[PDB]
Amino acid sequence: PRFLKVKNWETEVVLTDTLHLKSTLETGCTEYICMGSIMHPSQHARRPEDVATKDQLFPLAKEFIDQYYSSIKRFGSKAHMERLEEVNKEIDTTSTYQLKDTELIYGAKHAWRNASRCVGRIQWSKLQVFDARDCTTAHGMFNYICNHVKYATNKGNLRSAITIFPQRTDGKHDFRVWNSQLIRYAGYKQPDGSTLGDPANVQFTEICIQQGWKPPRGRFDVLPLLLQANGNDPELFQIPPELVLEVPIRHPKFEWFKDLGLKWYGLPAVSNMLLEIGGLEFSACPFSGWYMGTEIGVRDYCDNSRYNILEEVAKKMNLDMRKTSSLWKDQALVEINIAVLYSFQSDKVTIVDHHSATESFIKHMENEYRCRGGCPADWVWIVPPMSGSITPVFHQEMLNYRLTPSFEYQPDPWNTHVWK
Amino acid sequence: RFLKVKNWETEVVLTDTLHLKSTLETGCTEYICMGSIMHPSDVATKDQLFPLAKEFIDQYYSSIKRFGSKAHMERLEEVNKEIDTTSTYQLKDTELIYGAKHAWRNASRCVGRIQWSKLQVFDARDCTTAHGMFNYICNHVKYATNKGNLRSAITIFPQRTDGKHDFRVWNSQLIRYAGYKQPDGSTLGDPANVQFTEICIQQGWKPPRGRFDVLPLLLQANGNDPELFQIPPELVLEVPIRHPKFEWFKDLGLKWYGLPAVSNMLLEIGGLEFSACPFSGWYMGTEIGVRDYCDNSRYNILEEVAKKMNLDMRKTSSLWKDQALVEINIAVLYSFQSDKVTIVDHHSATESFIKHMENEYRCRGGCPADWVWIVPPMSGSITPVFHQEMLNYRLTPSFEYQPDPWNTHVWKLV
């Protein structure tokens, strides 16, 4: 029916969802099977694999233009009807259409607003949008990305931003950032078989080396940018180091911590996702905000197939590592996340702890149910990866559904690119 | 059809075919996922019972490699007679044991299922009064407790008939601590149990008004008014909580009971409904250490522990809550191990569950699992289940929720 309730089991607040009635595409679940913990549950996309026919693209365009003109209290106005007819002609004569600046901004902000996996969405309407649709080469992509990084970093007072490159046309002329984030550290396969640096990035690191990058072969080597424009072969660029803000990790109590020689970068900037607005696909759309401390201290530092530094911290702390039941992993994990937050705050680099972020999200949910009739949210991703049940989102029921505009996953370009 | 599930830490990929056997709803639709809803969303007629019974008997005779046998066909014949004549039927003892074990094996929210086939089943279907239920439950507690070497067990009371004669254990668990709200708004004891404590006091219980009063059993036989019984205190094994490094921890006066024993769920086997079926295992430490002690609506001792730890409790970003939570959970595990009372830490348990899950995919074609419940309430991503994709679906026999009995019971006396 016309409503589904969600309950918080701590406060007994009940919210009533009607926004899900506007959901467009499949979650992957059914009556009989829930796919809520599948990373990529569904391949349901809104238009086929490349350049659609008119009957495929125009309905999606009309739906978005309708939604945008409703959003600004028109619908049916002179400009709405003209825009429809203008999109109609543009598709007739080019097989696609071009978004207005206002529509582009509306679409980007609503993709963030609709991102059910993102705990940071209370900030969704404060997003700086850089229109990079006039770009034609990898050199121009590099210039746009450098300006984004400089604006977003803002000497540590971080600012959310997205830079949007030309949309897909036929699928052979894609713009792509091959990096998964604008700033990541290299990972190196070692002679014995261990890994130096960040193990997630071993393959991408090897592509960069195989493209002519000379690796300094350290533990915190900022990877080059690997940029593809208009379907051509990708090109390597070194981000100027003065644009890459980094934080040395120290601990407020353990003076030995800084001798671990750890650091991390300040700017999280996802660059491998696809932005979908009214049937248009922006395959290069790097966006950035600021970290929740656990993203560094829990996942980046302590995943087994990542930096895996729990061993060292625990040793220096003189914990019993004979058996799991001493909870030495849990104890070192806390100290590391204390140190990360203390270090970012000491250097006045924007960062949020998982207690503050999750409390912000409960408040965001309440705002969204009050003004919008709902808020799509993926509990599996929203609950932080440590200390789950002492955060308020753990006890919050959530409904997950897919709204458009949206951010989507896309295949890695090196599986699909035909080299020249 | 097949569905694949991937582990993103190990890259292992498993193939689920067992989901084709599912039947009831998950609650999700093709366009909305309700995977984090706690409870998504009167007795069966003859026509409804026939196919439910058949499916169960079919699955039982398949499990014992007797499908299609003369004994299979005769059991089906016999079951349909009973349904036809009496509007219900009676499980054989073998079927009851198999059903009980498979409800556990099918419990998608339970991380402890590697143990599912070692379950001691106590058949209590001959019971007729609350005194009889008390006797059965006492024997269950004593067998399961086993002087600290805990053994999984379940006791199964008579099935529902017309819904007007249900057997129920009114307690949510066999052993729990009372909670008392004070006139000044504070709480003594376990805040989760305030409501049920009130019900007991009203039924005539004389409460000690301490921090760790074991609640009485409130037992309902054959739809009559429930009756109060005190579990003999020497059957309730308890563990005083101390910490291996903080000698002051013992001065918090904390203790917990050793036997976790859920008593408010419904066991469904072949369409038959067993509304009183208390079952018990042994604890994962975080059930006590994270939830029982550190939930805000529970004993809520993060404050005192962090205070005695001298933590900076002004800013959240000092992570004092996280730091104190770990120490409480260290204390819980150390205390049980010292007293040789069975317990498992969340690292050992999630590792065992991954091995169980993989074995289940191999021999059975899958393993329904609820990630939201399987991932422990602390240190999620440093356990192996966090990175394990899982499929959730409902197989029968199963354990289900049922309404609380004080909401539906119509009283008889005065």
Ligand code: HEM
């Ligand atoms: C401003 C501060 C922000 C914070 C604190 C934040 C927080 C987070 C966190 C913790 C995650 C989980 C990431 C992971 O565990 O891998 C996430 C995911 C995500 N965020 Fe945000 N975010 C912020 C800004 C943004 C912005 C500006 C956008 C887009 C314009 C965005 C879009 C997304 C998307 C699409 C995901 C899902 C990514 C995926 O599925 O891999 N976020 N966010």
Ligand code: HEM
């Ligand atoms: C033998 C040791 C066992 C361990 C270590 C164990 C562990 C757990 C844990 C940690 C949970 C989640 C509870 C929570 O966090 O609230 C759970 C749930 C559950 N367990 Fe097990 N369990 C064990 C035995 C059993 C047995 C013997 C049965 C039934 C015969 C059973 C059936 C269930 C069910 C039905 C649930 C879900 C309850 C609900 O949804 O409220 N478990 N178990």
Ligand SMILES: C[C@H](O)[C@H](O)[C@H]1CNc2nc(N)[nH]c(=O)c2N1
């Ligand atoms: C709202 C949310 O579904 C709820 O808090 C769940 C989350 N996961 C859980 N997981 C376990 N093991 N036990 C619980 O009580 C809960 N509670």
Ligand SMILES: C[C@H](O)[C@H](O)[C@H]1CNc2nc(N)[nH]c(=O)c2N1
């Ligand atoms: C299998 C599981 O869904 C997967 O590991 C998810 C779980 N939850 C997550 N949550 C966040 N925030 N980020 C992640 O990468 C993941 N990984």
Ligand SMILES: Cc1cc(N)nc(CCCN2CC(F)(F)C2)c1
């Ligand atoms: C914009 C943004 C802000 C933030 N604080 N965090 C993220 C996520 C960082 C990268 N995530 C790993 C993944 F690939 F899953 C996405 C993105």
Ligand SMILES: Cc1cc(N)nc(CCCN2CC(F)(F)C2)c1
């Ligand atoms: C048999 C069993 C063993 C164990 N170690 N733990 C439990 C769970 C205790 C209570 N659980 C909360 C709930 F209501 F969901 C059920 C049950």
Ligand SMILES: [Zn+2]
């Ligand atoms: Zn679902």
